[PDB]
Amino acid sequence: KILMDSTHFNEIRSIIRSRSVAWDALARSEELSEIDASTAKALESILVKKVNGKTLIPLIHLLSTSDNEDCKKSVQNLIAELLSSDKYGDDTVKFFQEDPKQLEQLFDVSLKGDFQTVLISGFNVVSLLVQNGLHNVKLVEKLLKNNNLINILQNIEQMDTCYVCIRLLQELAVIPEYRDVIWLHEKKFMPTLFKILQRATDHLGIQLQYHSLLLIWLLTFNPVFANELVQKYLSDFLDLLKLVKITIKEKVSRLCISIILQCCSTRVKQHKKVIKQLLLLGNALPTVQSLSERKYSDEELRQDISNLKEILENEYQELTSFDEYVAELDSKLLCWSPPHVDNGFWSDNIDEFKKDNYKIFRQLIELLQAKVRNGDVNAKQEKIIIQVALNDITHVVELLPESIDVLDKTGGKADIMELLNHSDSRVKYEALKATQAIIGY
């Protein structure tokens, strides 16, 4: 196979070889012809253990004729073994390149039959398509569109199948047309990649995560695909940074750093906007600063981390605390930021809050109302957000009290009164402080 050295590929090959059907037995059961049985036996002796060569077509015909699951698994295992073998496999790939019918038959066999047989056939097809002559974007797209490949990729319990699929996609990503096919497959099944990234942030799993990161980086190598994936998941950069911080593998960290840099690279559209959004939401600057302080054995990973830190510092140089506050308000997430407790920041941003007919004040009132509606859950994060919103409202009422009338009109006083009866002691204290700042002494 193309990546038969992987543990998942070896396990799939062993599973396929477990269900083995003899060529003579298939011929006896009218599942193959005598010449086809002889060709299958020769191929089995050559690979499973003489090369079939031109006889591989009779073996494929016998496999098609033998619809039994055991025979299909045996044929797939033999094909995978031939692909792994240096002498065999290459001849089959050359024959498929010369005759597109053989390549089409191999693609149809891929991701078909039994799960082990489907995996072995897909690995054989990937190995055949690894050659430049036999490479075909249409065959790769057809194999990816198969339900078996999607099930293997989404098989959380079957980590080996997901790792094999990710490795196959990463290997196919070298060819630009196959790279576009892999990008389309990623756009279709981004949920599997997101789940893998979340699992890595929170072995077979490590290899699968590394393969997924490599595939993501290969897709992001194209600026258009990187720009498309940037808006696909705003938290993807934060998840990648968390996984890189958690993971100690140098290769995984380097791949994550390269993927993060590609999204913020100048080649991708809206590079400055993407970098600013990442730094505002995922705290790219602090994570990069922490990574720079930490020592990394890999020189390439260290250089990538240094470049990412420099990019984050350059992006944050133009940004200010007002941009961070705006991003926090847009994300509706507040955890008692330094600007909330900074008297100078509130004094210098009081006019900004009241600007545009108190647009920021209206947004804060809407966030407080949403938190009050979400106050039934009374989650710790929700309680912290509610307390931060109450503190911001109290500050905006104490300074430039014109916003107090707007808040009262928009039900801010009613929201504060409702929060005054909240079960949480901190929320009740914050609401009482806001009420005291409103009309109290």
């Binding site: 290969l218 190598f221 194209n222 590609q262 690279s265 080649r267």
Partner: peptide, 23 residues
């Protein structure tokens, strides 16, 4: 390898822009 591949694509695009300038 991915970074080098992206550089080759960007380098080819720069040469492609030169062809438009040559045109």
């Amino acid at each position: 390898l991915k970074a080098d591949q992206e550089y080759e694509i960007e380098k080819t695009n720069i040469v492609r822009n030169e062809t438009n300038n040559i045109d």
